[PDB]
Write a protein that binds this DNA or RNA. Structure first.
Ligand SMILES: *P(=O)(O)OC[C@H]1O[C@@H](n2cnc3c(N)ncnc32)[C@H](O)[C@@H]1O
Ligand SMILES: [Mn+2]
Ligand SMILES: [Mn+2]
Ligand SMILES: [Mn+2]
Ligand SMILES: [Mn+2]
Lengths: 439, 252, 245, 243
DNA sequence: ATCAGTCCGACGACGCATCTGCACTACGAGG
DNA sequence: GTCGGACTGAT
DNA sequence: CCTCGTAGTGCAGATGCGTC
């Protein structure tokens, strides 16, 4: 309401001037401290460059390159082909449109009859307008949407009309990541650095960031620890580190290691409160529409109450037991005509972990509890396959497992880490999982 | 004068240029004492496009020397796609710009005049293959399009067996067969049988050729011979002759 | 308050002309006429529509009524009637508006009243130099012949004929001279040459078949302005600023 | 078996509009009727199509247990190429499907027979607490009038009354249907409720060719009935299930 | 003077979505 | 993914 | 029966998304 887009524009201007992550974080913290409530969640969603995290399943914006070129030509009242050529010359479309606002402007209709009522734009109205623009498909779609986009583009100032272009591209070229913002918030609100672990776990809980930020700015740091990992907003799979197969895994583990197999395909995550099926991709986006038949195996093969499992999506040969390339599988995950190739594209929901089942926090336990949990909540069938726990003795036996894998194909062998503090966390890379690959 | 022609029916003229443009993108138009003759053939030379204009349709004729203009249908087609008023007055003349089509429509009383850039050239003599095609007939117009759209969905062959003067069409592949008959004017209007033979023509080009039979409200003449190129003769309602030559591909 | 127009076809063009040009507008129902003015977010258009409150089967207004809408939605259902049919609209609360198709099996619909805030646009007192009265349906021929290949329309106000053409790859000049079938009235004033956008003169060309005599009113140093004449002195005031500069 | 239907338009129309819920079907040639009873891949809406021994004049009966399937796309596309009210004729080949149009001229087609068989008819015999009748044209008009608003559809009923209502967040659709206004007659029942997806019952509106009238049986949490009557003892059914 | 983890955005080549234009087309509207 | 490829400490 | 025209309707022709 009373705010403006000028201040965030200025802070963005003084954002691509520091290459020290120990300095830009302090300025980000000062900025967020001076930021105003009731709009801070929208400000954050602007910062990461997304109107809403895609775990809500919203359709993506359709603006691209050529549409933006046409809209820029419209707003600038300048030749479309000239801007096309200049973009062919200069890579940054922001600079392409930048010179088009100060040396010359657009006359329009309002002003000749006489009216003086226009002030600085604000982030609230811009965000609302962009959200309205977001889906708005209809039938006579593109002309209206491009009209409004170019109008809002013309509704700015020559200096600020550079970040908006990137705001539509799908990335913000300030080099400020998400973890930097998390730690900046931890420094600002907490005052001490110890307020960072609670922010870390809060991000681990829900895929959202706006609600966590608003509850932070409402009460304070406290009243977050007891927030259980709930069915609903997804939880991303952890990462790992890539290396060879040396005489290192056995010594790093120390003892008998959980020898697993390296699987292939898009991962899976399920959020069912015994009534509805929420499926989230490896990234933060629903795949229920493209995967209608996988919401049913979970209801029968997994028995209990609201449960959270992580899986994978890879095709199976129909003639007999044999894997299929991911490239072939890519064509299946595109169409609404499921009942013409889904039955001919068998995919097993391989299970490797049962994350959150018994209605209370579960992820803070070592890598034996979940391994035993997954073996029991299952139904004997070939449609679902679980971690093929094979125990060897030495590297020679371990190399025998890799030889068997190579004879049977597939990616290869992946091995996890089991320990008291070695638990399935969310974030970083860590030594909890070790993935093996070579030439 | 060097360019003075007037045609009665704008729709017939535009259908002519549409039929020609469906086979290529350039225009060959020569004009001489006989009127205006035209010709255009595809590189593979399986279809033939010729536009002969009898020198009676043109209301006014005035030329200086037999010439030909290097005309091209690249963008002018969608410009000319706004000609209406049935037999609206259409005329062509000469200008240093290169060409100026004048179309006037009295339905709402407007004037369509456009500019093209295409210089003159040289004329070529009348060029029509000469052969005897014993079997010949002039039939309706929708029948050919029906044949095209009912044979294009079973393969690409197009074989005709009119044995015992009883016309039979058999094409496609062995499984997705096609059986159809053409008796004496039962779906036809005029039929003449002189010989019994097989055709084995290219059906994709058959549909391509029949694409140009929308508008010419007149029973078009057709003839063929034993594996010879097939002939289809059209008499324009306003005036002009444009025929077909289905060049075969031996017995492959 | 209740209103029924025996025709629905008129209430299709005054929505197609209103759908694309702006996402939302206000139906300022008045005690005298139907005040509907809709600017555009682009500010490169202005369509104003004035209908006397007599087309309906004698339906009277009670007080100012602000029915919001959604353009795409508004035209989504209005396409039902292809035969001779009418439609009854009425409301009581200033939150819910009741729209009911009639003629066939009655179809009633409650539409949420949205809120859109916009500023009043100053009225128009701009004199012009061209006062043509060409065949309204002929403008369809002119536009669909000129802007089919180009991306810019240009007009010259000549002595006794409208010179609309577009240069570039080719120059397509079509005229509607007084003699053959063109103008019925025209005031020359002064010579004028001007150009206009290729789409803002494409949208406004599906509301033609309600009148049959336009009066284009424009000139040098003057934006485009045309308005038809509906039943009872209808006033569909459309505006369009010149292109480039 | 030899067939000759006096309506090459309507039969093709019904087969084409039923070729949007299935992907395969079979013909069971018998003494009095060749049936088409297939089950949808979604296991949501089962449909059965029956024909009499008088739908097609000049019909021939050859064997009591001729069982023939097909591929949906081939027949659908071929019979998309039908001209006008031509006396279409068919014949049965033990290993292939034979078609032969007969209008202003003589056509023909050929299609192979593909081996397939899956008979799972879900017996219904349900006690639907409603029964009402309306003519096809009104039904098609009212179904397609408000289809393009979303997916919410609730067939609420009252005492001897059948009403269509569609509810959306920004607007709602109420369609009064009394025997006073447009709902024919023969209305009986009580106040019930149910709901169905818009597209599922919308795409089955293209049955306006071999149509005399239609009935309507339904209730609450019970598979909805859609009996599309056809001339001379014909009727195709579209059993959809409530959400 | 040198090592071990460790964060962070370009890489463009795209299969198929999804709108857009845009020639046909059966059916209704009057002589 | 993905491989760089820059960025933070330590003996 | 003879003309439109008109909203559909199918078919190419673009641009852009999410996945490495
Ligand atoms: P890329 O296709 O290599 O990997 C995609 C995801 O699959 C998960 N994954 C592969 N193999 C395993 C094993 N053995 N255990 C757990 N997860 C596995 C990776 O996490 C990748 O994200
Ligand atoms: Mn997305
Ligand atoms: Mn896009
Ligand atoms: Mn993998
Ligand atoms: Mn994108």
């Amino acid at each position: 309401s009373h705010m403006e887009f000028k201040v965030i524009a200025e802070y963005f201007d003084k954002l691509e001037k520091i290459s020290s992550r120990l300095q830009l974080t302090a300025l980000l913290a000062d900025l967020l401290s001076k930021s105003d409530k009731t709009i801070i969640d929208k400000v954050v969603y602007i910062i990461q460059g997304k109107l809403w995290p895609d775990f809500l399943g919203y359709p993506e914006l359709g603006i691209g390159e050529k549409f933006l070129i046409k809209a820029i030509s419209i707003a600038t009242n300048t030749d479309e082909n000239s801007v096309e050529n200049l973009y062919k010359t200069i890579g940054d479309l922001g600079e392409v449109a930048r010179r088009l606002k100060s040396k010359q402007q657009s006359t329009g209709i309002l002003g000749f009859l006489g009216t003086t009522s226009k002030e600085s734009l604000t982030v609230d109205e811009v965000y609302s307008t962009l959200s309205k623009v977001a889906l708005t498909t209809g039938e006579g779609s593109r002309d209206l949407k491009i009209r409004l986009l170019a109008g809002l583009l013309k509704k700015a100032d020559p200096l600020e009309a550079k970040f908006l272009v990137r705001f539509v591209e799908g990335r913000l070229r300030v080099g400020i990541g998400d973890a930097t913002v998390l730690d900046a918030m931890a420094i600002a609100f907490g005052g001490g650095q110890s307020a960072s672990e609670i922010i870390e776990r809060a991000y681990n809980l829900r895929a959202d960031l706006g609600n966590i930020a608003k509850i932070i700015v409402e009460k304070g740091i406290e009243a977050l620890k007891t927030l259980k990992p709930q069915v609903g907003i997804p939880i991303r799979p952890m990462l790992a580190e890539r290396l060879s197969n040396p005489e290192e895994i056995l010594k790093k583990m120390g003892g008998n290691a959980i020898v697993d197999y390296k699987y292939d395909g898009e991962r899976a995550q399920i959020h069912k409160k015994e009534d509805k099926i929420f499926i989230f991709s490896r990234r933060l986006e629903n795949i229920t529409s493209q995967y209608p038949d996988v919401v049913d195996y979970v209801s029968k093969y997994i028995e209990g109450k609201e449960f959270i499992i992580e899986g994978e999506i890879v095709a199976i040969d129909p003639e007999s037991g044999e894997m299929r390339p991911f490239q072939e599988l890519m064509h299946r995950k595109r169409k609404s005509d499921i009942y013409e190739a889904i039955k001919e594209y068998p995919v097993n929901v391989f299970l490797f972990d049962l994350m959150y089942y018994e209605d209370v926090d579960y992820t803070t336990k070592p890598l034996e509890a979940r391994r035993k949990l997954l073996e029991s909540i299952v139904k004997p069938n070939d449609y679902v396959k679980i971690a093929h726990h094979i125990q060897a003795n030495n590297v020679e036996d371990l190399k025998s497992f890799f030889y068997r894998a190579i004879s049977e194909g597939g990616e290869g062998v992946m091995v996890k880490a089991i320990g008291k503090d070695a638990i399935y966390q969310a974030g970083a890379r860590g030594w909890l999982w070790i993935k093996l690959k070579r030439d | 004068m060097a360019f003075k022609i007037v045609y009665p029916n704008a729709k017939d003229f535009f259908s002519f240029i549409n039929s020609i443009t469906n086979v290529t993108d350039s225009i060959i138009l020569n004009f001489t004492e006989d009127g205006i003759f035209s010709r255009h053939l595809t590189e593979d030379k399986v279809l033939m496009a010729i536009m002969r204009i009898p020198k009676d349709v043109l209301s006014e004729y005035s030329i200086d020397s037999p010439t030909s203009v290097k005309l091209d249908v690249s963008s002018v087609k969608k410009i000319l796609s706004k000609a209406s008023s049935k037999k609206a007055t259409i005329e062509l003349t000469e200008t240093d710009s290169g060409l100026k089509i004048i179309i006037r429509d009295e339905k709402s009383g407007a004037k369509s005049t456009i500019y093209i850039k295409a210089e003159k050239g040289q004329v070529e003599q009348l060029t029509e293959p000469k052969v005897n095609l014993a079997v010949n007939f002039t039939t309706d117009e929708s029948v050919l399009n029906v044949i095209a759209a009912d044979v294009t969905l079973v393969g690409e062959e197009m074989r005709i067996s009119t044995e015992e003067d009883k016309i039979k069409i058999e094409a496609g592949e062995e499984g997705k067969r096609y059986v159809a008959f053409l008796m004496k004017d039962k779906p036809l209007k005029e039929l003449s049988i002189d010989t019994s033979a097989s055709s084995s023509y290219s059906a994709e080009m058959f549909k391509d050729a029949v694409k140009g039979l929308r508008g010419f409200s007149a029973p078009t003449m057709v003839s063929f011979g034993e594996n010879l190129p097939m002939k289809i003769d059209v008499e324009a309602v306003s005036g002009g002759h444009m025929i077909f030559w289905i060049a075969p591909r031996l017995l492959e | 308050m209740k209103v029924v127009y025996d025709d629905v076809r008129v209430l299709k063009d005054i929505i197609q002309a209103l759908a694309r040009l702006v996402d939302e507008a206000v139906l300022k129902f008045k005690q005298d006429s139907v005040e509907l003015v809709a600017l555009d977010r682009a500010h490169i258009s202005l369509i104003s529509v004035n209908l006397p409150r007599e087309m309906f089967k004698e339906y009277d207004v009670n007080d100012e009524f602000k029915f919001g809408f959604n353009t795409q939605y508004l035209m989504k259902i209005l396409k039902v009637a292809k035969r001779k049919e009418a439609i009854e609209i009425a409301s009581e609360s200033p939150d819910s508006v009741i729209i009911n198709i009639i003629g066939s099996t009655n179809r009633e619909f409650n539409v949420r009243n949205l809120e859109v805030s916009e500023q009043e646009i100053p009225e128009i007192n701009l004199q012009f130099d061209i006062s043509a009265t060409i065949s309204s349906d002929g403008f369809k021929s002119a536009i669909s012949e000129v802007s089919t290949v180009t991306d810019n329309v240009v007009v010259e106000g000549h002595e006794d004929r409208i010179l609309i053409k577009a240069e570039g790859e080719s120059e397509v000049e079509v005229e509607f001279s007084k003699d053959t079938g063109g103008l019925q009235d025209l005031e020359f004033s002064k010579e004028s040459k001007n150009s206009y956008s290729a789409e803002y003169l494409d949208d406004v060309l599906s509301l033609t078949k309600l009148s049959d005599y336009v009066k284009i009113s424009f000139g040098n140093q003057k934006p485009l302005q045309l308005f038809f004449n509906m039943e009872g002195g209808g006033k569909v005031t459309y505006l369009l600023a010149p292109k480039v500069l | 078996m030899k067939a000759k239907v006096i309506d090459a338009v309507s039969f093709s129309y019904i087969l084409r509009t039923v070729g949007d819920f299935l992907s395969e079907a079979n013909f069971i040639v018998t003494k009095e009727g060749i049936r088409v009873s297939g089950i949808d891949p979604s296991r949501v809406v089962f449909l059965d199509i029956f024909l009499p021994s008088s739908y097609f004049e000049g019909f021939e009966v050859s064997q009591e247990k001729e069982i023939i399937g097909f591929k949906l796309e081939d027949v659908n596309d071929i019979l998309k190429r039908v001209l006008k009210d031509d006396t279409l004729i068919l014949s049965s080949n033990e290993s292939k499907l034979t078609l032969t149009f007969d209008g202003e001229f003589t056509r023909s087609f050929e299609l192979p027979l593909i081996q397939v068989e899956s008979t799972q008819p879900p017996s219904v015999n349900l006690e639907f607490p409603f029964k009402a009748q309306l003519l096809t044209i009104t039904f098609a008009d009212i179904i397609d009038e408000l289809s393009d608003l979303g997916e919410v559809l609730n067939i609420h009923s009252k005492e001897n009354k059948l009403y269509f209502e569609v509810i959306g967040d920004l607007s709602t659709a109420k369609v009064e249907l009394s025997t006073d206004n447009g709902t024919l007659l023969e209305a009986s029942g009580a106040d019930v409720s149910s709901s169905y997806g818009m597209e599922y019952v919308a795409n089955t509106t293209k049955m306006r060719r071999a149509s005399d009238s239609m009935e309507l049986y339904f209730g609450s949490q019970i598979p909805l009935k859609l009996r599309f009557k056809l001339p001379q003892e014909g009727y195709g059914d579209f059993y959809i299930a409530p959400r």
